[PDB]
Structures are given as C-alpha cells and as structure tokens.
Structure prediction request, 1134 residues.
Amino acid sequence: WXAXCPA
Amino acid sequence: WXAXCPA
Amino acid sequence: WXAXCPA
Amino acid sequence: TTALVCDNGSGLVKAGFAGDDAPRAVFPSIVGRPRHQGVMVGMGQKDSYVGDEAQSKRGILTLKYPIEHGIITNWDDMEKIWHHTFYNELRVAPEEHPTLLTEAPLNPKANREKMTQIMFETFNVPAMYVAIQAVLSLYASGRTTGIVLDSGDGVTHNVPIYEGYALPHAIMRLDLAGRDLTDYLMKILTERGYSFVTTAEREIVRDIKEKLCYVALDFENEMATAASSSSLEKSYELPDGQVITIGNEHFRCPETLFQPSFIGMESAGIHETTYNSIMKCDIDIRKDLYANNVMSGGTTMYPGIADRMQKEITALAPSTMKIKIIAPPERKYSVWIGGSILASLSTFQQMWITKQEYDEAGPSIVHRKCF
Amino acid sequence: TTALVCDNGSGLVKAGFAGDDAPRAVFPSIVGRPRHQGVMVGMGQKDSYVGDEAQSKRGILTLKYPIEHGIITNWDDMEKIWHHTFYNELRVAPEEHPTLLTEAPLNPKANREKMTQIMFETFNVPAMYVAIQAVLSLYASGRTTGIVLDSGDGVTHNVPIYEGYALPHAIMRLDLAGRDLTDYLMKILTERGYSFVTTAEREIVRDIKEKLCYVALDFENEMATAASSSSLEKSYELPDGQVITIGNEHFRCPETLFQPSFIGMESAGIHETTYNSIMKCDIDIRKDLYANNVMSGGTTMYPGIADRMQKEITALAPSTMKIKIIAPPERKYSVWIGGSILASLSTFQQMWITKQEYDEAGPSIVHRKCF
Amino acid sequence: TTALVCDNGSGLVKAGFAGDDAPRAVFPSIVGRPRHQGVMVGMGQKDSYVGDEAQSKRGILTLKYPIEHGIITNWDDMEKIWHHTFYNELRVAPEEHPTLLTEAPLNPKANREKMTQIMFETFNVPAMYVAIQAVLSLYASGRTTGIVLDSGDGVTHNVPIYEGYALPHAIMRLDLAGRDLTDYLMKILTERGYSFVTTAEREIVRDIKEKLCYVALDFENEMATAASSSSLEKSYELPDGQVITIGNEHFRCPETLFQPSFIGMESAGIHETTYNSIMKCDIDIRKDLYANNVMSGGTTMYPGIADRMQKEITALAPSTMKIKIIAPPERKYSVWIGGSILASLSTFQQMWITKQEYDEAGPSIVHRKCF
Ligand SMILES: Nc1ncnc2c1ncn2[C@@H]1O[C@H](COP(=O)(O)OP(=O)(O)O)[C@@H](O)[C@H]1O
Ligand SMILES: Nc1ncnc2c1ncn2[C@@H]1O[C@H](COP(=O)(O)OP(=O)(O)O)[C@@H](O)[C@H]1O
Ligand SMILES: Nc1ncnc2c1ncn2[C@@H]1O[C@H](COP(=O)(O)OP(=O)(O)O)[C@@H](O)[C@H]1O
Ligand SMILES: [Mg+2]
Ligand SMILES: [Mg+2]
Ligand SMILES: [Mg+2]
Prediction:
C-alpha cells in the first residue's frame, strides 16, 4: 500500500 | 545451527 | 607475501 | 478466437484458455536475478529468470515476487511475467484472445487501472475483464448463494453472495495468507534449530509448510500432547541431504489463521471474520449462508482446516443452525475454474471491455464492471 | 549474598557483581589448546589455556571460540570458561550468588535450556535468569522506549521497544558481526600482501580492525579519494616487528555492515534492517522509535558509524521526521551495565528462577520468563 | 594471428597456441646460475641457464624457482623465463599473438598488475588476459557446474562454481602443494637416512615423490602394515648409481595433504577444506557440487587420491548424498587445456585487454575482468 502496510 | 548456517 | 608467509 | 483466463495470484500464476477444466500452465510468480559473478562466458546466462526456470536455479538468484498481498508492486516484473506467460506457457499471440483477469476485493483502484493499461497497450488484447476472485470461486462451486473464503497466498478475502446479489458491505479482507504463514514458519523453525533466511531458503520453508503443516482440531490439547513427548514429530529432507525434525512447529504455523495475534496482528481469525461477515448481511439471508460456506485457495488445503472452521463457526453460530462447509478437492484451482466457466458464458460475451470502449474513456473504464 | 551478572558474549566474556557501574573482569571467550610437542618437562604445562592466558601465548595454541554467532557450540569449552570465570576472575563460590545471563533473541530453545541445566547442575547457583541483550541495553540507556541495535561480535539483532512493551514480531536478527568483519578483513588484507590464516593471525587481524578500521560517510567518494593516491593510508606494526601499510582496506571491512553483499549475504544492511523493523511496528509508535535509536555492542564503536546510519535512515525515513541516534561512550559494556541495573532492581528480585522452581519442571521452566 | 596460452605454474611452465589439445612446450620453471669456478675457457658457460637446460646440468647450478606459492618473487627471473619461452619454445614473436595467462585466486593485484605491465611494455602483446586456474580447469572438464580442486605445485585452491556463477566467498586457498610435499619428503627421508640438502638433490627428491609416492586409503592401517615388516618397500636408483630403499616414507609424504599438521600447519586437510567450501555455498547448490567434484593439477596425480578424497567427503557429507569425483587422465594439463578452449571461444574474443585500453588506465585496468 502507500499508507499503512507496505504494498 | 543444525540446519542452515553452521552453529 | 609481504606480511605472513615469505612470498 | 477463444478467450483465455489468466488468474494472477500472489505466488502462483495460473493461465489457460476458457472452456477447459484445469489451467494449462501453472508456475510460481517469481522473477529472479543473478547475484554472483558471471565468470563463465558463452554458456548463455540471462539477466533475469522468470517462472519455473527461476525456481529451478534459485541457489544463485534473489527471487522477488511482483505481487505481494494481492497488489502488484514491481510493474516491470509484472510485464516480464505476463510476457513470459503469454509467449512461453500458453504459446499464443495475445493480440487475438480476450483476457480475463482476477483481482482481490477491496484493492487500490490505481492497481487495477494500471493493470488494464499495461495489458491493453503493451499487449493488444481485443478485450479484457477484471473479476473478483471469490465470485469466480462461487461460479466454480456450481451454486449461486453462499459465502466464499478465498484464502489466497497474499490475501484472504470473504465475499458473501445470496441469490447472485453480492453484498458489497459485508466483504471482509484479511492480510493473513500463505506468505505470512511461511514467514511465521521461518521465524518459529528457529526455535528447534533451523533458520532459513535467504529467499531460496524461504522457498524451502514454503515447501515444508506445503508438505507437513496441518491444522489441529483443538490447539491447546495438541500442544500439550506434542509437549508430552508424543509421536507428533515428522521429518523433512532438505535439498542438501541433511534431515530436519519438526515437533509442534507443523501445527503452529497454520494456527496463525485462527489466531492472528501470533504475528502481532490485531484482526481476529478467519473463522471470526467469516462469522462477522455472515452477521453483517440481512437476517433472512444467513439461513443459506451458514449452510453454503465455500472454500477456495490452496492454503485452504491444510488437512483438517474444514473441520476446525466448522467447529469454530458452530460454536459462534446459534446451536439450532446447520453449518456446512464445502471444501472441493479442486480448491487450489477453483478461482481459475470459475473464471473459465464465466469467460465461456454466452451472456458474459457482451460484458467485455472492447478496444473502442477503452480508447474513449482512458484507463478508467474498468469501473464499468466491478463485482 | 548479591547477584552477579555474567554476560556471555561471542568473543568477550564480561562478568561482575550487580550494582557496579562496570564489569569486574573482561577476557576473550577463547579456549586454546597446545599444538606442538611438549618437549620441556617440569614447566607446569597445562593441557588447555582459557581466557587471557590463552591469548597471551597464542603462538603455540589453536584458539577455538565456544560461541559462534551468539550460539554455544562446544559445551565442554563453555563449562571450562564458566568455571574459569567463577573461580579465577570474580573469585567467588557460585553456590551462593544468583547469576544473570544474556542471550541473543531468536536463539534456540535447546541452547538456552542446556545453559540453564549446566548452570543449575554443574554449579549450584540458587537462582538464574536469561534476558535478551537488547532489553538490557535499553535498561542501561536509562529510557523506556526505543529501538536497540546490539551489534555484538557474533550476532546483530534489533529489538524495538515502546513504553516497555517490546514487540516480538519486528525483532530482526542478522548474523553479520565482528567475527564476519574480521574474516572479511583477513580475506581483503590478502590483496595488499598480508596472508593471515592461523587463529593467532586472526586475532592479529581483529586487533588491526579494532585499531584502524572506520566507517566512511560516503563509500564511493571515499573509494575515489583512496584510489586517487591520497593520504588515506595508515600503518600497523605486527608482533614480529614488520610494519604493514593499509590502503582502502581499513574502511572497506566495516562497510560490510551496510552492504552484506560483500561476503555473499542476501540480507540488507543494518540500516535497512533497522528501518524495516521500525516500519514493522504500529504507525503511532515510530514517532518515538525514530527519535530514540539506541546503539550497543563495541562493534558499533567504529568511528563515524553513528553519522553514517543517521544519514542512511534519514534518507529512508520521511524527510519531516527527526532521526536521532544515541551512541553512549560505554557502548562496549552497555549490555552488562543494563544487566547489573536489572539484577539490582527491587521488582526483579521475584522473577528469579529459584532452584525449587527448577527441580520440579526440569530444564524447561526457563520459558516462564522470555523477553 | 592466433592467441597463445602461457600458463605460468609454480614449477612447470606450460605454453602453446590456442586451439591445440595439449601444451606445445613444458619445461621446469627454474632459473639456474653457475656456482663453481670457470677454469675451462671456450666451453661457453653462460651466466644463467633457464628451463630444461638448467635441469640438464643442475650438478653445478643453484636452481631458484621464480614463482613460490603461485606468487612471483624474482621479477628478473620471471622476465628471463618468459623471454626464453616466447623465443625458444614457441619460437614466435610475441608482438602479434595475444597472450592468456593463469593466476591463482586470492593472488596479487600487485603481481598481476606487474605481470601485465611487463608483458605490455617489455613485450608488445596486442592483448592480454588473466584467468583463475580453477575456472580454466572447469572449462577443460567440459561441464558448467562443479567444485574445482586445482592442487598446483605452489598453491592448492578450491573455487566452487554453479551454473557458471562462481561464488567468490566460498573460495578457499591453501598453501599446501607439491613444493611443500617435496620438502616434507626431503625432511622425512632422513629417518631411513638418505638426506638431500642441495637444490639438485631437491630435484632428485621431487623425482622420487613423482615416481613412488602414493596416497593410502586408510593411513593408520597402512602405517601398521608397513611397520609390521611387510612388502611395502620400493627401491629407487639415484643418478650416481646407488640404490635407496623407501619404507613407509612414500605413502607418508602425500598424507600431508589430508593432515597439514605434519609440517605444523593449522589449516585442515584438502578434503575438509573442500567440504567447508561446499557448505559455504547456498543450500540448493550442494546437490550438484557434491556430484560434480573436479580435480586438477598433478599433486592430484597421486595414485589412490580420488578414492581417499571420496571416502573422506562421504564420511563428512550426509549419507543420502551421491559423492562423485571427476579425475580425468589429463589432470596435469587441465588448466592449459581450459585456457586453450577459452582463448578460442568466439564470445571471449571481445573480453581481451587491448593495448588501447591499457595505455589509458595504466597497469591497473586488469581489474576489468576478474574471475
Ligand atoms: N499442499 C499444500 N498445503 C498447504 N499449502 C499449500 C499447498 N499447496 C499450495 N499451498 C499454498 O497455496 C498458496 C498458493 O496458491 P493459492 O492459495 O491459490 O494462492 P495464489 O493463487 O495467490 O498463489 C501458497 O500459500 C502455498 O503455500
Ligand atoms: N575500538 C573498537 N573498534 C572496532 N571494533 C571493536 C572495538 N572495540 C571492540 N570491538 C569489537 O567488539 C567486539 C567484542 O565486543 P562486543 O561487541 O560487545 O561483542 P561480544 O560481547 O559478543 O564479544 C569484537 O567484534 C571487537 O572487534
Ligand atoms: N604423477 C605424479 N606424481 C606425483 N606428483 C606429480 C605427478 N605429476 C605431477 N606431480 C606434481 O605436480 C606438480 C606440477 O604440476 P601441477 O600440480 O599442475 O603444478 P604446476 O601448475 O606448477 O605445474 C609438482 O609438484 C609435481 O611433482
Ligand atoms: Mg487466488
Ligand atoms: Mg553483546
Ligand atoms: Mg597449475
């Protein structure tokens, strides 16, 4: 992901 | 170690 | 060699 | 000519033409690059091995999964994997066959839009489609009502559907999946004495989890039995030849699904998320949702997972309600089978995203059809 | 009487009573055995020298470290080292003083259990304890929140703690340490003319690395400056009297910490592992983790390591967040200082593993208290 | 015209054009100078004999090997040997033919750069290359994966290669070789009595070692049998005409390879170093490395060395792993054959170090191509 978690 | 790496 | 061993 | 379904999973890419009963080619979603010196000249060393070739010689490669947790991260790596699939596995020119792809629910719109753009511009597919994986799993199951637990490799989502009317508000998405279980197994195999750190060693641990791991009916009793010096001790042979012995690690790794607090995750287990998703639906619906539980994903392939989840749900659900869990033997390829069924439907042949439709709305028409 | 803390490191055993501000005795964790003929008779020639005496006459000995990467390998050698410590360095009878030890995180249950068994049976310590080294380093630093980088001689772990609640899922352990840096320095000191192969020569190379080696702020620019025939050239005097000259080797050896690919290790550098461990905690925690970075271990004693890692993390971390690295002058004995502080706490006096609690559950009760 | 390969060994210089299946000229790497007076005038006693002529009249010479332990010590003598080769053995002007050399791993940047400079300035070779001997041995073996044990006369290295990607961190180099074995045989021939102290007598001892010495399958049993007054007693004839009898000395001289403690060396035997090098690679590589062991050099020409090494490795390696040792009959010229194969490759024709590339970077561009 972009915010929260990686991906 | 026992498996992986020596120790 | 230069240090350690001859050569 | 004929549509082809390319289910891009988070670790196993499955591709094959529509109408078949099984994927034609299944290879790991791995792109590996050389790590050591290229001393030998003239033998034919490529700069990047993709797919089964990458795993064949993983001892000199740094494998990197383009998809993590159901989201593509390295778009060049995904272009490489898609080209390798289309031109080496199916051995077809993608300029003729419409392509159907699968995406997990509750995913960034940028991901799916960029996927459509790269598949529609770099290649020349005359049409394309993106469908939710659990909907395809429900299609493969042959029914029309039920709650699907598609515990993939990177994601574990849960889409409840009644009479074909999916409820896009009880959809629960969890980030626990096969990759996290493999990482936890790597972390807890250390306790016995084996620490697998490199990516190839991670693949070895994944193989160990695939071969030996299983879910106990009751965790506390199984742990006590294992600690009481019982026969619950299997042996695995590493590629180097030396044999490792696994104690209670082989039923502690898949217990993370029912207890995400093992890896410090706030969310509840898969059984509790399924019960909550069933609860969030209408009251008159769950009479069928309880009795039409559907499983998919090769992670949902642990021995005894079905009985454990049935017991947990029956404990959570009212006592006077029949809880039936459907676990077909083809759970690993259920999403692909459903995709092949859907792509061959006569009614679905109009819901494609044609090139004329794409060229007028840009890489944003993919929101015309969202499940 | 009073508890004594015996931090068993991977090359430097530190022991001393609790309440003191510095270890009483620090000697190498080396057990040396004679290698040549015992020609002279009547000299009191012992069959195994342990500790400082082993290093004093290392020219006729085959030094062997019982610990490799924070792991006990030769249990007879560790029994010898512990007996030598308790009966020659502290000069106490261990049957009275409870003993506190330190163990690296993600270490085998077998190793720690065997250590507890050998101390409770061979010696008669009325109580014992095993604590994570990073926790003791945080205790010594005087704060309660932060991320500890304890880069010892054998292991380099990283335990993030917020408000005293350590997160046992962002703990990253690396096998790069002072021993591997010494081996790499031996390998690259070849390139100038220095073939250190024997164990005594390994100790000489370790001394060279301790004295001259340092971490450059920028690696490529430092390589350019060194190769441009600049003044970056120090001289060292070997024990036999011959002076050696070191060029760029003295800042390439400790760069392996930030680039483990130098010795063919897939894992990323210490800065990248620290950033990953910080990002593996909760989002609201890193406000203090970035600003409370803590260093320990005398390897972290390379000149300029703090500035280099601060620059690397600031490059990795968001630009609008303060990155502070704490490098106390007592980094070498930080773990022992924290252990002495903890063993003297009034609250900790109940968390001991008494002999009564040991003689009931066997050498497995130690998992009552794991950090 | 055509490239020529001049493998500069530590006692046997092998030179010849590329594409041939065998070296054209093989002569000892010996530079001899007169030692006695010159009472005879007109006999043409030169001031320095080099090559086969030096060994022909070694009775009045003091032979001095320019290369010791694969390291050039006397550069004037090395220039003399190179000139003698190029102008008497191959009988070709070196200003036209590109030259390929062999150098041991973990060998000088200093001496290798000096050798490049001396061949680019004293001679006018339009191109030059320096390659690791073990890589050339692997080329000659015809395979692309394996672990090479090139036990030369001055050095004994071990370079493991998988799929053409050598791992430059498991490369183990040992200083035990044919010269040290000859010195040990010289020292232990004193037991039965025959002791050789001059350089010509050292050559005689080398001939004895070449002819009679062999490696026993089990050292203890063979020693007991020899000490039990058995038939293990060979006879050799000295040049003058007197016959010496060798008892257990002939199978004790090459036992130093598997037991370097005989001459007070801390390092382990060649079998143990090979096993350690195999273990230092990745876990998934060892399956092929165990079954693709490659031997080269001539101290590996001892009868029964392959069986002894296979037995020792199989004892060390896991029981369920196939251990195969490749010992081609052309082990003596394996490095030269590999060099001839490599210099004739079409892909290698661009990896040369041209004179234009040399005149811009000075005697330092050789690090453009390091194996
Ligand atoms: N026999 C097995 N036992 C346990 N897990 C398995 C087995 N076979 C495959 N898996 C798991 O299946 C996952 C890959 O298939 P799947 O669950 O369909 O996900 P994806 O399609 O995203 O790769 C991985 O997590 C893998 O470890
Ligand atoms: N001044 C120094 N410069 C570089 N390294 C040092 C220095 N002082 C100590 N060390 C390193 O510290 C290590 C030993 O102390 P420490 O880091 O606490 O580890 P351990 O307790 O496991 O022996 C060795 O790797 C040693 O080389
Ligand atoms: N048949 C043999 N028996 C014993 N030693 C041999 C034999 N053939 C060669 N050697 C030894 O091998 C060495 C020369 O060959 P090699 O090991 O390839 O070294 P180099 O590369 O210096 O020529 C010398 O030590 C020589 O005595
Ligand atoms: Mg899936
Ligand atoms: Mg420490
Ligand atoms: Mg050779």
